[PDB]
Design a protein around this ligand. Structure first.
Ligand code: HEM
Ligand SMILES: O=C(O)[C@H](Cc1c[nH]c2ccccc12)NC(=O)C(F)(F)C(F)(F)C(F)(F)C(F)(F)C(F)(F)C(F)(F)C(F)(F)C(F)(F)F
Length: 453
């Protein structure tokens, strides 16, 4: 069976198709044209993009496929190193860090982070309470202030103080610029060409900034001896039950860098898409606002109250369905195997899972896949296995899933309790790609309900 393949460019094969500032959205369009699987070739490499639950349920069989580092992740590894996100499953430091960190990310571990999440959420609510009448909110900008600050504080007892700034912090300026370089390197022939000497110079300097700050945080905390019980504490003290070993300080640095990138970016995207969909669907916004008012009966939300925001959780899942903010992941075949009864693969062959396309599979979701309908998630158990994968798969799934969802549920609950929202520009969705996805230029107005904190 000849696997479908999109248009080619002579000796460059399919590579120029990714020479665009919206590559995921381009791949989605190709998937619409070509169906559940297509081959994608560039000089010296091939992968296959999967979009159906029928095929993806096979790819998610951990006995048959393991996480691969995409080229994107290999480039991110230059600064995220052998942190959890950019490590191979077979690296000693993956299993050690996994075993050590997993407990501290449980739905139950969120009880300890809740107060610090509220600290940052209240800063956001106060910002918006303090806007004057004519003024508006830059949504992804403020969500990114929130989610960065939340992972910084809950995770490392460090305050980025993003709500005190227009200029986003020297660590973050570097981190953003590092991510940008990694992204550009993808659509770039002859890496060692003298032209990119300046790009390499900046890259190295940004790594230095990120490492300096973080190693200092580490060493201050070690020296100080003062004990929170936060993520960094867990790491400095905790031992892997299997090997009996702790993480070394360098790996700890890589984990912190990873959490700061991983631990905020996709979360700000989620919140921004959720608020986008709410203002475009006023009946949904009203139902969610009713729940927030009924449940959040105290000035400060409790942990248990956040767990009771069932409909707000449905809204977030439906936002993740339509626009999963980490929109792909990569696998390789552990052994020769046949995909879908039709497509033979050799050991080592790669697959890409195109999550937004999976989440539009009409055999799973019905014909109305573009509609925003939180009620799809009335009972999340009703969704078939491997149909909904915004947090990846298996032992390599997102370690931060419960953290992200607790934070997003708390913040969105507070926003809906405290304000009415207006889509005053009738905003036209424009999704910016930086590996991750966000609605660029999304702005709203928020009129206070005048409920005291
Ligand atoms: C809406 C928010 C988020 C989404 C959509 C998301 C999505 C994902 C996805 C798809 C993966 C799998 C990557 C792959 O297979 O290549 C992943 C892994 C990971 N995520 Fe997230 N994530 C989010 C939030 C967070 C947060 C808040 C943290 C940390 C606080 C975090 C930390 C990580 C880490 C460490 C991994 C690697 C886990 C491992 O392989 O051992 N994520 N995430
Ligand atoms: O990075 C890669 O290896 C693959 C495939 C690829 C890149 N170059 C190729 C040449 C020939 C064949 C395949 C490729 N790149 C892509 O699919 C892509 F277009 F860059 C992509 F979709 F934007 C992406 F890089 F995969 C991606 F989606 F941004 C991503 F990086 F995987 C990602 F998803 F965003 C992410 F960064 F991993 C995540 F956000 F963390 F999930």
């Amino acid at each position: 069976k000849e696997m479908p393949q999109p248009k080619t460019f002579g000796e460059l094969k399919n590579l120029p198709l990714l020479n665009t500032d919206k590559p995921v959205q381009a791949l989605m369009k190709i998937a619409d044209e070509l169906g559940e699987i297509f081959k994608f070739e560039a000089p010296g490499r091939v992968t296959r993009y999967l979009s159906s639950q029928r095929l993806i349920k096979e790819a998610c069989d951990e006995s048959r496929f393991d996480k691969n580092l995409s080229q994107a992740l290999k480039f991110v590894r230059d600064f995220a190193g052998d942190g959890l996100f950019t490590s191979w499953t077979h690296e000693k430091n993956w299993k050690k860090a996994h075993n050590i960190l997993l407990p501290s990310f449980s739905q139950q571990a969120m009880k300890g982070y809740h107060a610090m999440m509220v600290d940052i959420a209240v800063q956001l609510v106060q910002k918006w309470e303090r806007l004057n009448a004519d003024e508006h909110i830059e949504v992804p900008e403020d969500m990114t202030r929130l989610t960065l600050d939340t992972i910084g504080l809950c995770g490392f007892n460090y305050r980025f103080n993003s709500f005190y700034r227009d200029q986003p912090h020297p660590f973050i300026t570097s981190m953003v610029r590092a991510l940008d370089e990694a992204m550009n390197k993808l659509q770039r022939a002859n890496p060692d060409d003298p032209a990119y000497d300046e790009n390499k110079r900046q890259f190295q300097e940004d790594i230095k900034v990120m490492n300096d700050l973080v190693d200092k945080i580490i060493a201050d905390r070690k020296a100080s001896g003062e004990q929170s019980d936060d993520l960094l504490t867990h790491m400095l003290n905790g031992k892997d039950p299997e090997t009996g070993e702790p993480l070394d300080d360098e790996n700890i640095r890589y984990q912190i860098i990873t959490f700061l990138i991983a631990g905020h970016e996709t979360t700000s995207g989620l919140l921004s898409f959720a608020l986008y969909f709410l203002v475009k669907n006023p009946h949904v916004l009203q139902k969610a606002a009713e729940e927030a008012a009924r449940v959040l009966v105290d000035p400060v939300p409790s942990y248990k109250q956040v767990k009771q925001l069932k409909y707000v959780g449905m809204v977030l899942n439906e936002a993740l369905r339509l626009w999963p903010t980490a929109p792909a992941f990569s696998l390789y075949a552990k052994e020769d195997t046949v995909l879908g009864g039709e497509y033979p693969l050799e050991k080592g062959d790669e697959l890409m899972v195109l999550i937004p396309q999976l989440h539009r599979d009409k055999t799973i979701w019905g014909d109305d896949v573009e509609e925003f309908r939180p009620e799809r998630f009335e009972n999340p158990s009703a969704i078939p296995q491997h149909a909904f994968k915004p947090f990846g798969n298996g032992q390599r799934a997102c370690i931060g899933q419960q953290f992200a969802l607790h934070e997003a549920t708390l913040v969105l609950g507070m926003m809906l309790k405290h304000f009415d929202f207006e889509d005053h520009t009738n905003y036209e969705l424009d999704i910016k790609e930086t590996l991750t996805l966000k609605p660029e230029g999304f702005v709203v107005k928020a009129k206070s309900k005048k409920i005291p904190l």
